[PDB]
Paper text:
LUBAC is a heterotrimeric ligase which consists of the three proteins HOIP, HOIL-1 (also known as RBCK1) and SHARPIN. Two of the LUBAC components display Ub ligase activity, HOIP and HOIL-1, and both belong to the family of RBR (Ring-between-RING) ligases. HOIL-1 is a member of the RBR E3 ligase family with the ability to ubiquitylate its targets by linking a hydroxy group of the substrate to the C-terminus of Ub. We show that HOIL-1 activity requires linear tetra-Ub binding which enables HOIL-1 to mono-ubiquitylate linear Ub chains and polysaccharides.
To elucidate the structural features which enable HOIL-1 to exert its unique catalytic activity we solved the crystal structure of fragment 366–510, which comprises the IBR and the RING2 domain. The overall structure shows that both domains are linked by two helices, which are positioned at a 50 angle. This arrangement brings the IBR and the RING2 domains into close vicinity to each other and allows them to form an interface which buries a total of 1,303 A2 of solvent accessible surface area. K457 of RING2 is a central contact point for the IBR domain, and is coordinated by F382, E383, V386, and N387. The C-terminal histidine (H510) of RING2 forms a polar interaction with D385 of the IBR domain. These interactions, together with further hydrophobic and polar contributions by D458, K456, Q455, I452, V467, and R464 in RING2 with N387, K403, and L401 of the IBR, create a surface which largely obstructs the catalytic cysteine C460. We therefore assume that the observed structural arrangement represents a catalytic inactive conformation of HOIL-1 in which the catalytic cysteine of RING2 is masked by the IBR domain. As expected from our sequence analysis, the C-terminal part of the RING2 domain of HOIL-1L reveals a unique architecture not observed in other RBR ligases so far: The C-terminal 36 residues form a loop structure which is laced up by a binuclear Zn cluster coordinated by six cysteines. This structure adopts a compact conformation which packs against the second beta sheet of the canonical RING2 fold. HOIL-1 displays a tryptophan (W462) instead of a histidine located two amino acids downstream of the catalytic cysteine, questioning if HOIL-1 requires a histidine to assist catalysis as observed for other RBR ligases. The C-terminal residue of HOIL-1 is a histidine (H510) which forms a pi-staking interaction with W462.
Numbering used by the authors: 366 to 510
The structure:
């Protein structure tokens, strides 16, 4: 069970990652962190945050740093786009499964795509079909729900 450090400057707030929890309310500074954007964006959904962050690339050097950082993460695994709404999702250490914050699509992190077909939970006509006939979606999978 790995951990996340609050993004408020110099804050000592931290949490463990949990499969079903995508937001961290810091007990120190009380700010709400988003555990898939790794950022505090309390008047935005994740899509509004990520688009505005790309608009600050022209030009903030800090934003341009992180936006180009993310584009290497996506091009090399350790980050991915939601297969449904296409927001950039970053890893939650120890969690093989994530429910998108914007569209609520279940994402299989092990296989870097959807958990299920359209029609959602139970539809093994798409997605990673973990455990059908006993086979895990990947032999490293431990629990993608
Ligand atoms: Zn904090
Ligand atoms: Zn977010
Ligand atoms: Zn989504
Ligand atoms: Zn899976
Ligand atoms: Zn699996």
């Amino acid at each position: 069970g790995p951990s996340y450090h609050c993004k408020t400057p110099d804050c000592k707030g931290w949490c463990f990652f949990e499969d079903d929890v995508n937001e961290f309310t810091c007990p120190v500074c009380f700010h709400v962190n988003c555990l898939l954007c790794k950022a505090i964006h309390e008047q935005m959904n994740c899509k509004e945050y990520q688009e505005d962050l790309a608009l600050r690339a022209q030009n903030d050097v800090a934003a341009r740093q992180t936006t180009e950082m993310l584009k290497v993460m996506l091009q090399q695994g350790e980050a991915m786009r939601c297969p449904q709404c296409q927001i950039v999702v970053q890893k939650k250490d120890g969690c093989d499964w994530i429910r998108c914050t914007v569209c609520h699509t279940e994402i299989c992190w092990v296989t870097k795509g959807p958990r299920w077909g359209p029609g959602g939970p139970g539809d093994t006509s798409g997605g990673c079909r973990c455990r059908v006939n006993g086979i895990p979606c990947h032999p490293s999978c431990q629990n993608c729900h």
